[PDB]
């Protein structure tokens, strides 16, 4: 479940990033709530300080 | 004597998720803060921040908006609300609409709106609206100026900006650039001369003047005029500091030189400072291998004999990796009548330096010889140093 | 160990690879797969 | 801070005393005799740096309380806000422990 | 060499800027004292250190502070 | 095994705030200051006197 879910949520993240790029924005870590504590590495990684 | 764990090596970040119970206390505190009259605004903002951190991205949306709606009408809260909704378009737009109706006077909202709107026409429209509402916001004007591709409209915009913001320098410069005539320049000057402008605005005029690029001696005159007309605040080498960046642009360096000369003249008229000169030197040393600095040194040399300056000039030339040589030639030719005397008195290595420069320049070994001969002739008791090079 | 995979994930990946090699499972023509695993005994301990 | 640990106050660490006792000053003006006189004056927030003896005295204006309720509670919050502002103003080198 | 006769003397009683420091190195600090207190009801705050997640800050971090972030 | 003199507490302007063996330390602040400063001076003066 974790690996399949990782696969899913990273794809999702990528999509989000692409969207942001299209609309000229840094990717809002507010949007990634829901798919936050999922993925390996976690999406909590990408926005750690 | 197991010692105590150095206090400041305690564990810090990537903690466990914050406890509901814990959060509730914070919420209660924030409620108290809010309900004990609005701040007006910041209490709501604080709450929002807490929610963001807590974390939560739903409750905040529910509550913050509501809070905004009833009592407060501050730009800051609107901005916060906008931030909360990164959901690209519609909500943000709505928020903006809500804000500008209430606070049209606060630029921030307008800026936010501009940022939001992707299409260029839309952006332009927004800018126009802002202008209509708020006249003074320089940044907005600049943005407006930037947007357009055509000419007449741009010109009009510039004019409007000029009318509205009395002492925006960048805008003025842009306007000047736009019109492209000496008549135009004159008109601009006329427009400006009526306005009170003490500090350092005629620099622009000077710049405009030497757009022609051959004219250049009148620059000095203009510079001289500038300070006498204006009821001025006593400053030394501020102009130079400001000149720097300006000088660094194309077709400006020459202009800067004249200004520098004028400044020097003014200083002389006022009186010798000692510290001012030192400051100038320091400035020159900083941001080296630049032309305005060199010009200053040249001017100084013309005024009075300075071996240190000459060394400095040489150094500058080296850094550049010819101007100095040219200057020397000019000195020799325009006024060898008055220079020969001073040079003779000095009995210096200036001549030697010149010779060296010539040598460096030319492998053909005839021009240099000629120069040497001239020098020999020039010096009335003839200097000893010259002959060896020959 | 790479910096990409936690070992469970690595294992999973390996499994996937083994499945996702071209026609490994078909042995109709007597094809023989052989998945040699082994420690390199004393390796660290016997560097010159 | 106690009678005990008073000497702690004058180590080389920077500190601010914050008195919010005099924020909502209501007055009933009284001389040595004791006559009544009702009013609701301007207030203050005493903030003191006992190293330097700077006294960041925010003068709370009475305009604050016009149309306000839970007044006491509000006062505390106001004081806190003021303190925060002061802290912000202070540079990191001058800020308090 | 023998162990000393276990007697339990409390002779010292000292203190003094000079002597405090030294001893301050060995005393538990105030933040460590705070840590040693754990709030009662709550799931009390832990730092997951990779080598061992085990570690509870404890009531070092203030309630509000805990809810938000570090100190 | 004597008590021929007595040993007092060597205050300074950094101790000052922390000594309580001698009285008046918050009671009479400027008196206390005078005492402590005075003591310091004496110490210094004594040293100088010795040198002389």
Swiss-Prot record, chain A:
Gene: PRP8
Disulfide bonds: none
Span covered, complete protein: 1449 to 1497 of 2413
Cell compartments where the protein resides: Nucleus
Additional free-text comment from the UniProt record: Present with 468 molecules/cell in log phase SD medium.
Stretches assigned to coiled coil: none
Assembly: Component of the U4/U6-U5 tri-snRNP complex composed of the U4, U6 and U5 snRNAs and at least PRP3, PRP4, PRP6, PRP8, PRP18, PRP31, PRP38, SNU13, SNU23, SNU66, SNU114, SPP381, SMB1, SMD1, SMD2, SMD3, SMX2, SMX3, LSM2, LSM3, LSM4, LSM5, LSM6, LSM7, LSM8, BRR2 and DIB1.
Domain notes: The MPN (JAB/Mov34) domain has structural similarity with deubiquitinating enzymes, but lacks the residues that would bind the catalytic metal ion. Contains a region with structural similarity to reverse transcriptase, presenting the classical thumb, fingers and palm architecture, but lacks enzyme activity, since the essential metal-binding residues are not conserved.
Protein name from the UniProt record: Pre-mRNA-splicing factor 8
Curated annotation (Swiss-Prot), chain B:
Additional comment: Present with 2250 molecules/cell in log phase SD medium.
GO cellular component: catalytic step 2 spliceosome; nucleus; spliceosomal complex; U4/U6 snRNP; U4/U6 x U5 tri-snRNP complex; U5 snRNP
Keywords carried by this UniProt record: mRNA processing, mRNA splicing, Nucleus, Repeat, Spliceosome
Complex formation: Component of the U4/U6-U5 tri-snRNP complex composed of the U4, U6 and U5 snRNAs and at least PRP3, PRP4, PRP6, PRP8, PRP18, PRP31, PRP38, SNU13, SNU23, SNU66, SNU114, SPP381, SMB1, SMD1, SMD2, SMD3, SMX2, SMX3, LSM2, LSM3, LSM4, LSM5, LSM6, LSM7, LSM8, BRR2 and DIB1.
Name this polypeptide is given: Pre-mRNA-splicing factor 6
GO annotation, biological process: mRNA splicing, via spliceosome; spliceosomal tri-snRNP complex assembly
Localization per record: Nucleus
Functional note: Participates in pre-mRNA splicing. Part of the U4/U5/U6 tri-snRNP complex, one of the building blocks of the spliceosome.
From Swiss-Prot, chain E:
Full protein: residues contained: 354 to 424 of 494
Stretch list, region Disordered: 1-17
Top-rank taxon, per record: Eukaryota
Designated name of the protein: Pre-mRNA-processing factor 31
Compartment(s) of residence: Nucleus
Purpose: Promotes the association of the U4/U6.U5 tri-snRNP particle with pre-spliceosomes to form the mature spliceosomal complex.
Gene from which the chain derives: PRP31
Family according to the record: Belongs to the PRP31 family.
Domain remark text: Interacts with the snRNP via the Nop domain.
Organism the protein comes from: Saccharomyces cerevisiae (strain ATCC 204508 / S288c)
Subunit structure: Component of the U4/U6-U5 tri-snRNP complex composed of the U4, U6 and U5 snRNAs and at least PRP3, PRP4, PRP6, PRP8, PRP18, PRP31, PRP38, SNU13, SNU23, SNU66, SNU114, SPP381, SMB1, SMD1, SMD2, SMD3, SMX2, SMX3, LSM2, LSM3, LSM4, LSM5, LSM6, LSM7, LSM8, BRR2 and DIB1.
Something else known: Present with 1260 molecules/cell in log phase SD medium.
Swiss-Prot record, chain F:
Tree of life domain: Eukaryota
Subcellular location: Nucleus
Span of the signal peptide: none
Assembly and interaction partners: Component of the U4/U6-U5 tri-snRNP complex composed of the U4, U6 and U5 snRNAs and at least PRP3, PRP4, PRP6, PRP8, PRP18, PRP31, PRP38, SNU13, SNU23, SNU66, SNU114, SPP381, SMB1, SMD1, SMD2, SMD3, SMX2, SMX3, LSM2, LSM3, LSM4, LSM5, LSM6, LSM7, LSM8, BRR2 and DIB1.
Task of the protein: Participates in pre-mRNA splicing. Part of the U4/U5/U6 tri-snRNP complex, one of the building blocks of the spliceosome.
Other observations noted: Present with 432 molecules/cell in log phase SD medium.
Full protein name: U4/U6 small nuclear ribonucleoprotein PRP3
Annotated organism of origin: Saccharomyces cerevisiae (strain ATCC 204508 / S288c)
High-level lineage: Eukaryota, Fungi, Dikarya, Ascomycota, Saccharomycotina
Gene it is expressed from: PRP3
Residues of the full protein shown: 262 to 313 of 469
